[PDB]
Ligand binder design. Structure first.
Ligand SMILES: [Cl-]
Ligand SMILES: [Cl-]
Ligand SMILES: [Cl-]
Ligand SMILES: [Cl-]
Ligand SMILES: [Cl-]
Ligand SMILES: [Cl-]
Ligand SMILES: [Cl-]
Ligand SMILES: [Cl-]
Ligand SMILES: [Cl-]
Ligand SMILES: [Cl-]
Ligand SMILES: [Cl-]
Ligand SMILES: [Cl-]
Ligand SMILES: [Cl-]
Ligand SMILES: [Cl-]
Ligand SMILES: [Cl-]
Ligand SMILES: [Cl-]
Lengths: 328, 328
């Protein structure tokens, strides 16, 4: 009777809501990362290939996380980046370095096999069309239009000759002539590619910082902002946030003593409350940038993420980077 | 290397993020609903059991929807209800009317075989414990404190014979004596039962409206806010929003006329832009409560939901109730 669905765009929207909800007051959320568990999982926890057991999503699991909690750190907006799968043009160290499909988002100018414009950071492009000669995900369909009309994924047999370059047409269209067609999307500045992007992911600017400094992301020429309001994240189906947070022992010396056993758990709690002199006292949203677990109220807030890992030892004046992915 | 997970609380979290993002302003989100398609799917449609085609999530699809436009109603938060599956205790109209399982939320005082307190509305409870004897529903793992000491689903046998009544102890805990234990949650006002709930779902109040009017939801004697801060939706694992929006034909005496073949498509768009005269102009966000398919900047905002189904007739000053379920 009923035939409905939610679009790919909704996924990007749940991501933005999450990112945008972070702030202060009763309508916003405060996000904290917790670290804990100084006692071993088992005597083999330090051997290569060791996997610790999965955390348990139950009231017991939450209680356990709190009982072993050693410290907490407030997560700020600037610690969160929207990201998408990284696909480098011409990287002959991975399959299909010269073959792509409609909608693939490829990165150029990020390695010698990519080089196209000394003076520009990494450059990202979306494939708009491919050669008419190839193979369809649905084998029997040997015609591109037929393939695509039925919903098959066409993979061309004619390789991409040269990597796209420049910002293309007034519409961003680029025609290398090898039968491929590309659309310039944006640029990634070095401070970002160098410290925020990884082997598997690239950053895609949030709408606000984009609208704020179009030139920083080589976006000054874009016109689509007249309709999609600098919604680059929706244009590329971004639906994953990556945290880049830090644990500074300077703030938890009592747990970074010369021979401590390290920490093995990480979790994310939204809106934990502050500790209270008397249970019936008013609730206070924890907003300082860090807390000793005992200065927070036990079991308050909502534990939305739980992670167990092999131990990692903290030194008196060192810092541990914590990364975490949220797919929406 | 790592073993992590997103807890079920994250789903409620996303649902609350969405509900909380709706408002007025750039950072805030506006949301409109749409409908259309006078064009028939085909002859064999007005029949019975005619499953229409599945919409298309691509520019090609959003294209059809926009063109076949007709009307657009703005959605207010008051039109959104966090809901959960309705399981009335003793409803022999459905499977297992007397057997329950931990974490199942059950409604009481909703029918004669349910009655426990006249003058009050539906009372809701959560199954804390279930009877000893039972089949773990996974290999063996059968006994008492076992299929539990390893997170194994549990389906008992010594059926529930007595509905839980009252508000339990200082923690809402209740023990009938049939090997079942329950926790008092809240109460639904008669007006909400009639107008918001259905044979399928019951409404669970948002934290804010719960903090503002506790007694209205049989919540005045509550104590758990001292840690969960009125986060009832989290307690019952609510992760679905049910739209309560009406299409008022008196808001348009054009498409509503005797001939009228009807419409067949539903659509939700977020943050749409008010059509401009000069593209380069600064974009404007629609903040009215209604717009004509041409009054808006085509392809503006973001389309997050598409629905196709049989035809529906629109009268003069008639109002067809439009409903939609979003699952986070
Ligand atoms: Cl997707
Ligand atoms: Cl948002
Ligand atoms: Cl539990
Ligand atoms: Cl919990
Ligand atoms: Cl920040
Ligand atoms: Cl290749
Ligand atoms: Cl950085
Ligand atoms: Cl935004
Ligand atoms: Cl797109
Ligand atoms: Cl406390
Ligand atoms: Cl498309
Ligand atoms: Cl309202
Ligand atoms: Cl039963
Ligand atoms: Cl009923
Ligand atoms: Cl609220
Ligand atoms: Cl327009």
């Amino acid at each position: 009777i009923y035939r409905a669905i939610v679009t790919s765009k909704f996924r990007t929207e749940k991501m933005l809501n999450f990112y945008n909800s972070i702030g202060s007051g009763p309508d916003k959320n405060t996000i904290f990362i917790t670290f804990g568990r100084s006692e071993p999982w088992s005597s083999n926890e330090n051997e290569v290939g060791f996997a610790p057991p999965y955390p348990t999503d139950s009231v017991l699991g939450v209680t356990d996380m709190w009982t072993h909690m050693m410290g907490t750190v407030k997560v700020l907006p600037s610690m969160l980046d929207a990201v998408i799968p990284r696909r480098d043009w011409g990287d002959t160290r991975y399959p299909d370095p010269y073959t792509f499909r409609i909608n693939d988002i490829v990165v150029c100018n990020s390695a010698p096999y990519n080089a196209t414009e000394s003076g520009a950071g990494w450059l990202v492009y979306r494939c708009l069309d491919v050669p008419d000669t190839g193979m369809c995900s649905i084998a029997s369909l040997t015609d591109k239009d037929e393939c695509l009309k039925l919903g098959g994924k066409w993979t061309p047999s004619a390789r991409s000759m040269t990597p796209p370059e420049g910002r293309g047409d007034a519409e961003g269209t680029i025609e290398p002539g090898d039968g491929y067609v590309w659309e310039y999307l944006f640029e990634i500045p070095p401070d970002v590619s160098i410290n925020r992007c990884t082997n598997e992911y690239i950053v895609v600017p949030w709408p606000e910082e984009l609208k704020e400094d179009p030139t920083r992301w080589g976006y000054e020429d874009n016109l689509t902002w007249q309709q999609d309001d600098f919604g680059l994240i929706y244009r590329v189906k971004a639906n994953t946030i990556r945290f880049k947070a830090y644990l500074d022992s300077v703030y938890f010396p009592e747990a970074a003593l010369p021979g401590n056993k390290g920490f093995r758990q990480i979790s994310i709690i939204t809106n934990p409350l502050e500790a209270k002199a008397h249970p019936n006292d008013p609730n206070v949203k924890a907003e300082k940038d860090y807390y000793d677990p005992e200065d927070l109220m036990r079991h308050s807030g909502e534990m939305i993420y739980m992670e167990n890992r092999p131990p990692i030892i903290m030194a008196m004046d060192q810092t541990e980077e914590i990364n975490i992915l949220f797919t929406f």
